[PDB]
Amino acid sequence: STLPHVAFYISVNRPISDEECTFDNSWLWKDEKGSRPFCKDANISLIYRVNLERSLQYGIVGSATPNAKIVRISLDDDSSGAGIHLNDQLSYRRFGASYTTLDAYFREWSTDAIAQDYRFVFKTSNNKAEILETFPIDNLNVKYEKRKQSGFELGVTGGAEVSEDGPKAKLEARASITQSRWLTYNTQDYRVERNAKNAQTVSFTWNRQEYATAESLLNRSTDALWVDTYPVDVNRISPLSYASFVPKMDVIYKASDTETGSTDFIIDSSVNIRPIYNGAYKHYYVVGAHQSYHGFENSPRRRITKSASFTVDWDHPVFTGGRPVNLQLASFNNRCVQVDAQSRLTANTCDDQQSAQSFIYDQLGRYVSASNTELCLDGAALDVLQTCNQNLTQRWEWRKNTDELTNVYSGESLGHDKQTGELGLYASSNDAVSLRTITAYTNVFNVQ
Amino acid sequence: STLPHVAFYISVNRPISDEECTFDNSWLWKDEKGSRPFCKDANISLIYRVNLERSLQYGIVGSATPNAKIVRISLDDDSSGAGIHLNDQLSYRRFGASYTTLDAYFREWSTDAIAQDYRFVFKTSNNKAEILETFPIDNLNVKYEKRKQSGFELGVTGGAEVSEDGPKAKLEARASITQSRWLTYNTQDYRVERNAKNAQTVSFTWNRQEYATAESLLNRSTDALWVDTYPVDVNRISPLSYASFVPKMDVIYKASDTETGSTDFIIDSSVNIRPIYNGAYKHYYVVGAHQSYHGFENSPRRRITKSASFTVDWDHPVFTGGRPVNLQLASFNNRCVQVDAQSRLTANTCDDQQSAQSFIYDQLGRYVSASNTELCLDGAALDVLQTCNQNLTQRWEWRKNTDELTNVYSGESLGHDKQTGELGLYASSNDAVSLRTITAYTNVFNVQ
Amino acid sequence: STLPHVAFYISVNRPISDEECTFDNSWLWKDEKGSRPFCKDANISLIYRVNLERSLQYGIVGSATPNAKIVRISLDDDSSGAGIHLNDQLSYRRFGASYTTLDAYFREWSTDAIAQDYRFVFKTSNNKAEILETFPIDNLNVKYEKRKQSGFELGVTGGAEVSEDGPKAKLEARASITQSRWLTYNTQDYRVERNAKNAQTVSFTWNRQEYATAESLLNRSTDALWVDTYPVDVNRISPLSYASFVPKMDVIYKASDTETGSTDFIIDSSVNIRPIYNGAYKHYYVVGAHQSYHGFENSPRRRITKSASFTVDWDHPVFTGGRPVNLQLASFNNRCVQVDAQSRLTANTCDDQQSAQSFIYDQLGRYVSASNTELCLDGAALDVLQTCNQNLTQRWEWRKNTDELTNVYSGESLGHDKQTGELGLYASSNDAVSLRTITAYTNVFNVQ
Amino acid sequence: STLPHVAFYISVNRPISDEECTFDNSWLWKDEKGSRPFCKDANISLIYRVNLERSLQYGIVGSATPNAKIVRISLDDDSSGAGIHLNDQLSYRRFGASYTTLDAYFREWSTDAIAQDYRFVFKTSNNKAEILETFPIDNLNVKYEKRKQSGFELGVTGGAEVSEDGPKAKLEARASITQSRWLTYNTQDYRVERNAKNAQTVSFTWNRQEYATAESLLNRSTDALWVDTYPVDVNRISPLSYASFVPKMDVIYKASDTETGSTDFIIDSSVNIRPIYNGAYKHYYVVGAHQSYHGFENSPRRRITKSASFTVDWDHPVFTGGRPVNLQLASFNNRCVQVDAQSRLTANTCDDQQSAQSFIYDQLGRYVSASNTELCLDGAALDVLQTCNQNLTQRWEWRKNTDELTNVYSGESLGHDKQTGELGLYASSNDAVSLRTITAYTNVFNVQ
Ligand SMILES: [Ca+2]
Ligand SMILES: [Ca+2]
Ligand SMILES: [Ca+2]
Ligand SMILES: [Ca+2]
Ligand SMILES: [K+]
Ligand SMILES: [K+]
Ligand SMILES: [K+]
Ligand SMILES: [K+]
């Protein structure tokens, strides 16, 4: 009775090799210090849930929901997978300049790679489907709190200084005017950015926001020359950026209710791997020589992607919105009514997953072919399916408490020849004709 | 009618011996001051709840949930156990340097061990199962509150100083410009870090965050030489660190609906035991000699683990999603239809937990073997189970208000020989054949 | 139909005698000033609610809840009792040193005792039961709010001083740099600390947190010598400390579904009674002599405990999960089927609370003994209970609208001899045999 | 079907006479200035709701609620009364010292009395009942917000002074270190303090908290001598202090399910009436003479109490938990079965409120005397009530669609002699015996 679905999981598993995230050990002296792997068993492991369905059940008229074929791709709390992993913990290596100098970089630290962003792109092979809705629904409309302060202050002062010179009196008056502005807003360390290039493609990117630059990771900005310590505050790097990331997003595609052909849906899951480079700069000043710490933002990044795809055939029986049944000729042990390519009807061995043996019993009482809902079983000519119309010969009702299917127009029962299974209309059975018809729901809702 | 489960508890009990958390009494003089136990009846006591189930009931088609075999491992409010325990209360010992000096560490305190972190690792013996979802769902996306302030201040001052010298007048003007930035965020003393190396393994770690270092536990940083007191603020160490810790987490594994074989699931519960070492450093300055307190972070830690495991056989009857019944031949006191290894049918003494005597009565009316859902009881050949298909001889219905099982194809009843229990189809009973069949639900949902 | 319970209250009443909380009048001069009672009709009055039950109803298979025997001990809003009481109000006594001095304590106040902590310990006599869950669920994971501020300030100043000496002009420039850190967190005056030593014992302690020391109760730290007043701010001592304390906690124990024997559960409710001692110290300085107030933390404390216990017999009928009935032989005025020690059946005068006359009517239709669910009433041999199996002679059904119990295998009715009550199977009653059986629910759910 | 209650209101009305709150006009000169009434038609008007009930309905076994007899005393939103009233508005009188002086109190104001506290004490005459639960559930566990701030500030200053003497340059450097602690918590002007001396008595006191002292009511602390004004800020005295106070509290007592005898419950409602005295102290100083305002805390207080009480008979029929019926012999116009003191049965004129004519029709079908649930109507001997047991002669069922009560054991109907109403068992009625029995619910749930 309820709306049928085609539901399946898509596993996206992609181990990231050691060479796939090997970067130069240093950014200032990239040609001298060699290279090393900045990850440790990096991996992508996601599980998408895909649903195919019609927007409404078969034959429902006057609904407030438009008729459409819906493809829903979801990565939610019920089905997410392990996630994207880069590192168990972050380490660093320190490198010094092989030659001494005066005003240049003399030290460098390279920290294990973090995820600059995670990107998930949903594409479509053709334009038969359009994005109907997504989750997250939209980019954030940031809320700001503004605050204006105005103040004044009035003061007086009376002093009395007594010394050998003589009494000395002071009188002072002060007036001050103050004005300040405040701005308050919220950030996160990863901000979701939704980017919809056109009706067929949308991408969700979780981008580093609060500490996005290597410079922002420094807990100290200046130091004395004798200080030689790691200047990065690793506590500012959340485990969300290397240990495990799981996105939450939904994409709903829709096609027109009369769409034909097929469409490939592609999901691109990627992580922008970014090693962190920091350098110490020697500033020689006559007053005092100090070192200043800097982060390099032009350092290399590598995007590691895994693509998953599935094909949707818009003529799949799930997009009729109905639950099909078969018509089994019960004089035989295993024979069902089957429709071939040119609409003719034959009796073949029943197959529960064969859509050519599936019919939808609609509201009018017609048996419409599940593979082509424009064709009906017509009692006037029971050798080929006929175009659905309002013919009374196309309407059937089940005789109560029996296995007889009767035609509405004439009241005759659907019978089949006991030798060949050829269908016909008969007032009553005889030696050569059986009136026993058995119907059961078929399972045509497997992804094929 | 509802979906069956296999549910059981796994107790993880591990007393931690005195030697398992014996550390050096001192960190600076580890070879001189001996060792002592830093715990007091440390213990791990957890109770995991495991559920085995199918994602859907047997034979349901067109659902929005994909077909899958689900393994759920839970440590929640309904079933958690005592928890992980290290100490009733924290004590300390003070040690002094055996030799006096000038600029070195001269005092040390070693505090009873706390839990640096609690780690729970969920592994899998092979890749037949993948992590589908977890709780906690993901690592935290930290929210920051930024605040920008800009201000200006204008002032004037008018002074009048009178003395023996003569009247003196002052006029002053001030202008100030201010700019400040605020950053606000929340921490905890234990932060959950989710780490999913691949599709088969996930680890949850509760890591000390707010006071993670021995240095952060010092309530004072400097003191005069004559001061000799414990410099650690024990109020900063919550009872969550040593008295009792109970995690809350769920892991859901999934296997394909056609998975075979078996899989071992391993749960590793561990605590990273960390003694706390602090030292007082003597700083001799000509202006003034003082002592500065330091915490040592390179001090030893010991991880104490307890592993629990259970085996899941993917061919368990619970993963069919149906509730099996037996077919008892009621002419005998105790005889049931039983399937042997090669599919033949015999009559044996009924066993309520024998899956070889269990059948699922499906929607079509077939009796499919619970141990192999591809085999049916077929009325055409009642000596071996046959492959499930759409044969009408494989469909059975119960005659109303009787103990007769009738075949759909021919209408004959299932009968058994009164001496050997051999099955057959009969229009009516006779002296040698009984038509009495009794069915009851079997209990095949025990973990075996 | 629903799950039966054994429910009862445990009253824990313990008046605390005057000598049980008599402490020394002074801490500095404990041998000179005598002793006094620091309480006023101190009392412990708690009411625990205990529930015994099975986790599931009898015979339920395939549930997501594991089979277990549950013991629930609760002290909640529905049943708590009066609480723990120490004082109606807090008073103090002042004591002075009998000898004058220069730099020593010269005054002391001893305040009426408060509760340093309230402790509730749940123990178990053996390891047949394990803690499954508690309330409070765990120790608190404290949440901290961190705040970083950075600022700069730029200023200019222009002064013009005019006097007899001549015009004088001033020009000044200021630059400031500021940095501050904030840490915010919540405390209570009593913090719950959960301490689970092992799988059998858990203790909950409400420990003073915000004002835990006598020093923290002083509203003033220094004073002039002539000042002679009580230096304790009694408003900082909440009525929760002495007037009435009621804990809220739950402990759920579980045993194996096949546990035998018995187990003693012990509840230890205690209060750590602590008198408050403060002293005034005379500090003689040439610049100025003052007095500083101090609190003494090494002052004595006394723990006053009351132990309650109850015994759980794991073979109690409540742990079957079923609601038993008796089988009354209705030809007699008062005769029921009774099982003796070795399984034989006799007719004895009915007792509604006798578990030897109680049977569970299970899903199969068997009458299993409530005192031993492995024994059934078997129609093949109606003189001794038989091991439960799938025998059809062990299944019974009630003939509709009558008082006849019929055997499933043969259809014969259960009858009893009209003189001795010996059971048997009969097609019909006669002069010596009655077929009238009456069944009613028995009350075996009293704590015994 | 549902659980019966005995419900009634207790009105506590106590007008407070003028002399009952007449205090001295002054505190410093109490013997000179006379006395006056500090209230204006002070009054106590409260309405308590009392419920008597059993914890469970009659005959319910296996419940998670223990069997108990419950007495509930409530003062809630549904039933509270007018409240406690002291004054329409607060006025004051000013008094001056009859003799002038130098350093002493020279003025005094006496303000109309406020309520220092409202106290409600629930007592019990004996220990048959214990406090099971209350509302408010417990004393408040105050929550504190702590805040630590640490900061540093660095500054430089460059000055250039130009005058006739010559150019003068200044260079300054500043460094500051700051540290602050914050503590935040909530108070009310009336705090509820629960005080449970033992299992039988609990008191609730609403005590003034925020402005509890006469000193805290002063809006000014010092003034010049010529100032002569009322120094009390009457806006700090809420109308809750004098105009109307209504408490909200519940007390639930429980007794053993087999308790006998009676118990008196006492409710003491009182208000601690407190006049407010303030004085002005003349401080003569050579620099300047001023007056300082003081409040006196040792001023008199008077507690005005009204006691209400009610008696609970633990053998009241409401504590059976069942709804009784009577057995009316319907051959008479007005005759019911009645039980006398020694258990004999007679026919007397029916009284709907007579518990001696009330029976509970229990689950077994027994007619249990409502005044003594250990006695049943037994068909073997219908002249005296018999001890309840499992006799089949003690079970009755109503013949359908008739007024006949039939015995379960023999099937005979309960009949009564048409002249005397003597009960008996008869197969059929005759001229001297009527089989017509009429039953109706009786109203035994009035407080008696
Ligand atoms: Ca509408
Ligand atoms: Ca849907
Ligand atoms: Ca489930
Ligand atoms: Ca329960
Ligand atoms: K602000
Ligand atoms: K701020
Ligand atoms: K702040
Ligand atoms: K603040």
Numbering used by the authors:
A (entry chain E), B (entry chain D), C (entry chain C), D (entry chain B): 133 to 580
Text from the published report:
Vibrio α-hemolysins (αHLs) are β-pore-forming toxins secreted by Vibrio pathogens, crucial for the facilitation of bacterial infections through host cell lysis. Here, we investigate Vibrio campbellii αHL (VcαHL), and establish that its hemolytic activity is significantly stimulated by calcium ions, with an EC50 that aligns with physiological calcium concentrations. Using X-ray crystallography and cryo-electron microscopy, we decipher both the immature and assembled structures of VcαHL and elucidate the conformational changes corresponding to toxin assembly.
Cryo-micrographs of VcαHL in SMALPs were acquired and analyzed for single-particle 3D reconstitution, resulting in a density map of 2.06 Å resolution. The map revealed a heptameric complex exhibiting C7 symmetry, featuring a β-barrel transmembrane pore channel. We thus attributed this extra-density to a calcium ion, coordinated with four water molecules, in line with the size of the density and the observed bond distance of 2.3–2.5 Å, typical features of a hydrated calcium ion.
